[PDB]
Amino acid sequence: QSMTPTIITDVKSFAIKPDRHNLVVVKVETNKGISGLGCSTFQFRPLAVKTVVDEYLRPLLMGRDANEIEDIWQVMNVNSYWRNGPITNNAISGIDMALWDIKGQLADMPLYQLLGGKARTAIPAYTHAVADNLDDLYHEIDRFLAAGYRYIRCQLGFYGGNPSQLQTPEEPISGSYFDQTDYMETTLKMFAAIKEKYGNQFQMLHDVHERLHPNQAIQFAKAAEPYQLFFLEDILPPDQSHWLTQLRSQSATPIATGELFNNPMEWQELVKNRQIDFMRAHVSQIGGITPALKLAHFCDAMGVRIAWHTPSDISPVGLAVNTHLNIHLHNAAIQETIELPANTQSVFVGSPQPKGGFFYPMEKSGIGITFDEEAAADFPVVYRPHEWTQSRTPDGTLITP
Amino acid sequence: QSMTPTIITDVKSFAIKPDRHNLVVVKVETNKGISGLGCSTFQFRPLAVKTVVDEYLRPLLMGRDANEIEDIWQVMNVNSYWRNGPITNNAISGIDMALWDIKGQLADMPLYQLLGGKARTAIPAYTHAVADNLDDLYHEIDRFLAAGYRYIRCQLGFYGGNPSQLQTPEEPISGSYFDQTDYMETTLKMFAAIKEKYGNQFQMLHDVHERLHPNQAIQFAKAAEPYQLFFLEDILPPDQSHWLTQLRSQSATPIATGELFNNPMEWQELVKNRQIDFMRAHVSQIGGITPALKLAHFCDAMGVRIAWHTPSDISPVGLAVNTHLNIHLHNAAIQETIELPANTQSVFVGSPQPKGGFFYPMEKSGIGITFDEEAAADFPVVYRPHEWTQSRTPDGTLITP
Amino acid sequence: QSMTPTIITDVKSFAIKPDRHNLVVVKVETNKGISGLGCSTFQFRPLAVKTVVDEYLRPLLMGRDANEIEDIWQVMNVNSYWRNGPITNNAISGIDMALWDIKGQLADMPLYQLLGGKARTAIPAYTHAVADNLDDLYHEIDRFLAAGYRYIRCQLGFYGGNPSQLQTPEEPISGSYFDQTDYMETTLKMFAAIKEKYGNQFQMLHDVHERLHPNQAIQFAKAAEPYQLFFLEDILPPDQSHWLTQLRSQSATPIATGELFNNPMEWQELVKNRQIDFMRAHVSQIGGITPALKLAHFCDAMGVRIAWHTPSDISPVGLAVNTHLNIHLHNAAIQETIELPANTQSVFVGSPQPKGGFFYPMEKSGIGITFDEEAAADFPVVYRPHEWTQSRTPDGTLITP
Amino acid sequence: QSMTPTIITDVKSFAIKPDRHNLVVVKVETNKGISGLGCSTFQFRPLAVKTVVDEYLRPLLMGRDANEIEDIWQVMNVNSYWRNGPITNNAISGIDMALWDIKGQLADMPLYQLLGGKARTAIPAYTHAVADNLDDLYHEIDRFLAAGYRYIRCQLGFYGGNPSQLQTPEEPISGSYFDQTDYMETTLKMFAAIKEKYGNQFQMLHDVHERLHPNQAIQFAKAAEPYQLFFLEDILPPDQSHWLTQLRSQSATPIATGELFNNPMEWQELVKNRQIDFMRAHVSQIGGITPALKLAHFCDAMGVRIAWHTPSDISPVGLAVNTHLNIHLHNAAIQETIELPANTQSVFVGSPQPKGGFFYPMEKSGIGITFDEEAAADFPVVYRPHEWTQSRTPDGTLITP
Ligand SMILES: [Cl-]
Ligand SMILES: [Cl-]
Ligand SMILES: [Cl-]
Ligand SMILES: [Cl-]
Ligand SMILES: [Cl-]
Ligand SMILES: [Cl-]
Ligand SMILES: [Mg+2]
Ligand SMILES: [Mg+2]
Ligand SMILES: [Mg+2]
Ligand SMILES: [Mg+2]
């Protein structure tokens, strides 16, 4: 034959914290001595993801033929009967990505080539500029412009912190407090100042990060329209996305959403009805490369573009996968980038980095990342309280974070 | 590197007629000595497809890097500005399939493995039973049942021929004549007779082949409901598919359509609105494997299944491609089959054949078909008049064929 | 009788290039010595159109009664089973137009009279002003205004060329490059400058030529609204025209589209739902005069107007046909015009030319064009690479051209 | 030139009653000695139609160029500012038809040839079988079957007459009385009896003639479904046609309507939304051939077929026009026929008659009818009370007739 079964002989998970974020990576070993890596990084619940991989997915997968990625994905997806969700899908993602890594290595092709080759020369990147005053923000923007970036996510002010820092009722419920009206006003002030100073030199992005009640979100998105953002992101929480119908009939601000999605019913109608311009799914949250390709193709049919969520809390394996998908998929639009720290580079070898404001194709076979098991051992998970997920308006209402 | 450019060094087309149908196949040669085959078979206009490949696609493609299938597809698709259509897309398909063949060979994987592996053990097949009387029809059905088929397309009577054979006005316009009411009545008689004789032993399919005016189609599809067909196919022509809205609200007969499609606007709303159950696209009519994968994924998002059109007028290259797609795609449902004649097997080596009513995965790297250039030379194109495409009702109205 | 059969005794095609564009014209001869001409001009695939006419339509048509234009159209339209598309329809168009030419000659009436007579005195014309700077653009506009034009298509800048001319990634994929944001900004700058200088002296048109992603198209069309264009054309590619729903609910910019259409499913919903103001079909792309009349009447029912695509790459036969249709149809709005060069006038006699900014009725019987077979012989087809159909944004993405 | 102006030198109208129905015909004379005839027959208000032609259309039209049918139609249509309606449109129709007659004569072509030639060999005809008992109905059906008819409109019982003939309140308001429940029950009894006796030998039609309240109409149409009528006609009055939405979602009975229409807003949504299968417009009620062609093309786009209203109260000029339209239009379905009496044949020469259940193309140039002015003089209009238009249910409610 030209191809024999590739038998899974081990499944391992590694929950580690080299730098600021808890990561989870999965390694699948085979009888051929070809191993694959995958990203299962859900930084807030890494121990729970590890439990799923070690106690449930490993015994399910042992002995199976890794060549059949599609069937294995389908099996994993429904294996616990109840399905979808952030812990469930991250565990599945690590396996699915590792199987694609293995297939690329067997083919001796980088992942983007195995998938059908490139759709572009390189994918544009965007960086993040955030400061509590305009002067410091301009300095960040200036640096990125000199580095070749033509797309920059911009935020003025910080929106969290002790209730002592703003007007609240007495004895406020503990949490991370901000004022929605101050957030909107300050951000519009920022848009106007950046536009006046930089004009067409680059395109702003901005992430509303579900800070607003529905009508506030609609008003804010309308107000963003004159500033010609590349996109305005997450103006509504996932379960109130239908409110976009009112916005879309009166505004042409470009809309991105989806980093929070982990269930197809969150996006099915949005995509079918062209209610968003950019799908921002986090690949591991939707269950890996297998479902990501299908989603990208569904979006493409509707003219919806892709901008996978690629935050600081992603492993270099997940970063590499997004790079391959972005080079291959015709409807990929942009690649979110945050600089990788030194400890992380010590554990993961081969991570892509932007060059002159673009990410170029990665050429090693498979995903292209090597994992140093021994170095990883020095960086166990460390518990974080992440108080920003207890976000409150001044009256003490717990809002979507 | 793990992978160097694969430079296209020739593009050849072969219009041939080994048996009953004019075929067109394309061969792409590379600097690596790896060649790929593709199907461009549009049996009614083979010389026009050959003109497009030889005069336009060859000079466009010479020297390009065959690894970049996605980019090359995008380039070909819009290259003549005006696009879509049966001649345009068949020419593109032959190239696209050949590039996938090359990529599979470079990977040393059969196409279904390169795409992500299998989603099933084997795809069910269906055959065709057609006769002008019930007794002969039963004999065909009996033979197929003994052979292991559980799905059989059934047709009673022939619907064409000289106007002398039915009541028409005097001096009828020349054409292939039939009576729509006789067709409907005879077919319902067939459904009832088969159901009484065979019950649940197999599932019938039936192809209406756009024979009907819209209300007739709706009535006929409703009348088919008690007979539990696997699907009822092409009840409406492509430009009147919106009439399905009336049918779908009052009937649950399973509906298949799409073999005629060669423009995404033919299916976009049908799929988005779940107005069909099975998409029956002819892969070469939609431009090859690249767009077929995207369409299958779009359909999958909506719960629509795939049953690629696989008639007698398809080359063994196109047949092999459908087999790989059917093994790989989770939403593939069934594979239409017609027996391959001896002359064809003389020119094409490696064609898949059903075994016990299923098609199994093909294991040679790439698509898996070898083409005998020398044998092909003995079978030039031969002009056919195909009078059945001049179909008329008794009054002489030219209807969709 | 008052009328005997008109038997088709030959069908000839001529693929020629007198000037800048490959043309295809068809000639139908009859037993009455009355011949007709038709336009089958698809400049990018002229040899393929010729193959269809010579190898397939000629034998189908020989001996038929040319009087029955409607039946012959219906026969041709479905003759290859699969149908629609640019090559298929252009071949059909040449025959259909020639039959109308013959019928007009037998009637001794110009085509517009045969169809029912005029609906206006003369159809307004529009010309094209394009330059890479405002000063040169104003000089073009000034000249057209003095010539009597009240409608002028305006474009500032050129949007194509070597990737060396803009910022791209290294080793850019070959193609014709432009920047969408620069295109939008420069065009809005043009609208504002022309409005300030000329005010109400004439109405601008502008052709977006499917350069934009969907949300960009919507934003750009909204931004065009204050400039009171006669129409804004092709803001979206044909398979993403549904995105107009979002635009139409928030903007009253006049929208034209359809030059790319060659399948009724591209326009059926757009027209039914009044989502466009002007239908810009290219008559030969939709299969000739027979389907053009039906489409114009369907549009008229919905209040949609007609502006047939009449570019430089049309034969004088196609130009004459559009002139007759524009004089006759109540909902015809405007006639796109580009000057005809000398070599072309050497081969075709009788071409209409605008006078004082209008086209007047043509008075010779039939279509009114004579074709010089001998002169045509001096101008064979010459292959063109047309790199503009390989249009890319800076990242290298192949976009709709 | 090939064609000079054709100047209108007189317009005459003739209101006559050769047999059972008041007819109105119009004659347009020209400077060329070519005259045309048109039908303005609105049998209930013939003197009012004559007033419009003689007092208003004649002075408007005198001296105009008859060649410009399209412009003249547009002028007539809006000439009284307020427009549409049965008297307005019938007057316009007579002129429009006469101008087409003139154009056909100038072309030396029968009207169907001038329009583009035939779409079929001959149009099927249907006759009417009506009796107050089944036996007499069967005798009518038997006779028509022997004559070659395959389509027969069937009615059992008569639904009108003195209130003495059914149960009513005392001192009933004068009118023509019937019982809706008796009508529905008797008609379903008829459907069942005919089906049992004749089966597939012919297809029934039935005209509900707006006898029913909306829910009754929906129930009745559903109940007709098993009987496979060619169509069920006028189940609802024109201003309650929207009630079809409920019927269409649960029934596939074929629906025809439109003989009452004289305003495009009556049909615009019905056709656009495919809520009817057959459009039954009375050509003179919609303003003549010019708007009839447009309506037929609009219907064709939507897959709606045409069956022009051709009752006994139509002039032979109107009958001839319908015959030409039915031979030419691809979506024409059937031609209603009632036998022409002897006095009428004395005044009009050239009337078409069905042969073996079909109407064949008419071959004289123009419409093909000659009018005997002298014979017409013997048949002045005679006032009729037409009590059937005062239709009442037993309680005395005046219902749509
Ligand atoms: Cl932000
Ligand atoms: Cl084509
Ligand atoms: Cl069948
Ligand atoms: Cl322009
Ligand atoms: Cl009136
Ligand atoms: Cl009746
Ligand atoms: Mg975000
Ligand atoms: Mg079929
Ligand atoms: Mg254009
Ligand atoms: Mg009626």
Curated annotation (Swiss-Prot), chains A, B, C, D:
Coiled coil: none annotated. The keyword Transcription does not apply. PROSITE patterns: MR_MLE_1 (PS00908). GO terms for biological process: amino acid catabolic process. One of its GO terms (molecular function) is magnesium ion binding. Keywords: Magnesium, Metal-binding. Signal peptide: none annotated. Mg(2+) binds at residues 207, 233, 259. D-arabinonate binds at residues 209, 259, 280, 309, 336. It comes from the Bacteria. Belongs to the mandelate racemase/muconate lactonizing enzyme family. GalD subfamily. Has no detectable activity with D-mannonate and with a panel of 70 other acid sugars (in vitro), in spite of the conservation of the residues that are expected to be important for catalytic activity and cofactor binding. May have evolved a divergent function. This is D-galactonate dehydratase family member EGBG_01401. It comes from Enterococcus gallinarum (strain EG2).
